[PDB]
Design a protein around this ligand. Structure first.
Ligand SMILES: *C(#N)C1=NC([N][C]2[C][C][C][C][C]2)=C2N=[C]N([C][C]N3[C][C]N([C])[C][C]3)C2=N1
Length: 215
């Protein structure tokens, strides 16, 4: 596996979004990983529908939270997910709409990365593509991050309360990091992204609830 991987440079990552006034971070993390696979398989980079997931993954809690594994299972059993153009984001839960048209992407299930194993996470990012992960984002230091490789001793590996997308990994001035795509708009962090410490004992629980869809 390479020392460095950044899917933004290959054109495998769509523009940063803003989940608005809804706790749908999990829907954005799930579509980001599906967008990566679609691009890999077809060459087209398209915005898929987080709203489709918010409204229809009944096993999840809409704007109240949810799991990415549940979202991948729903796409598999439903035969696809709509594009953002076909099922636009409105930022509140609505009834699950059915678009008779074709779905924009499909998946054959998912895989979970072994709990706490950052080395397996690194290999999966290198070989598969962007990976959905969950972290503890409760700290003021995370919320107001601006630059550098983020590391905070108070981060709690067992308090997973936010979902994001790992789109690469690398090293900056001697510090190994993970390149993380957030869904709080481009004004947050560094143009919507954050570099999080890599190989510093699963800091913030980065490798504790990671998964990717099979396409
Ligand atoms: C996002 N946005 C989001 N996600 C979750 N839960 C998931 C986090 C990642 C792993 C799978 C579960 C949310 N649960 C609740 N909320 C609303 C906002 N939170 C309310 C509780 N406080 C303590 C933290 C913020 C979620 N939002």
């Amino acid at each position: 596996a390479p020392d460095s991987v950044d899917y933004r440079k290959k054109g495998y990552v769509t523009p940063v979004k803003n989940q608005g006034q809804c706790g749908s971070c999990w829907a954005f993390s799930s579509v980001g990983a599906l967008e990566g696979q679609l691009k890999k398989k077809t060459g087209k980079l398209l915005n898929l529908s987080p709203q489709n997931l918010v409204d229809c993954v009944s096993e999840n809690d809409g704007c109240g939270g949810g799991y990415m594994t549940n979202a991948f299972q729903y796409v598999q059993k439903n035969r696809g997910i709509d594009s953002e153009d076909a099922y636009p984001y409105v930022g509140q839960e609505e009834s699950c709409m059915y678009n008779p048209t074709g779905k924009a992407a499909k998946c054959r299930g998912y895989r979970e990365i072994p709990e706490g194993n950052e080395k397996a996470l690194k290999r999966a990012v290198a070989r598969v593509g962007p990976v959905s992960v969950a972290i503890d984002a409760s700290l003021t230091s995370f919320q107001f991050y601006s630059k550098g490789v983020y590391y905070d001793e108070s981060c709690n590996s067992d308090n997973l309360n936010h979902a994001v997308l790992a789109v690469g990994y690398g090293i900056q001035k001697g510090n190994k990091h993970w390149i993380i795509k957030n869904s709080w708009g481009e004004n947050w962090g560094n143009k919507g992204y954050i570099l999080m410490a890599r190989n510093k004992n699963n800091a913030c629980g980065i490798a504790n609830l990671a998964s990717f869809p099979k396409m």
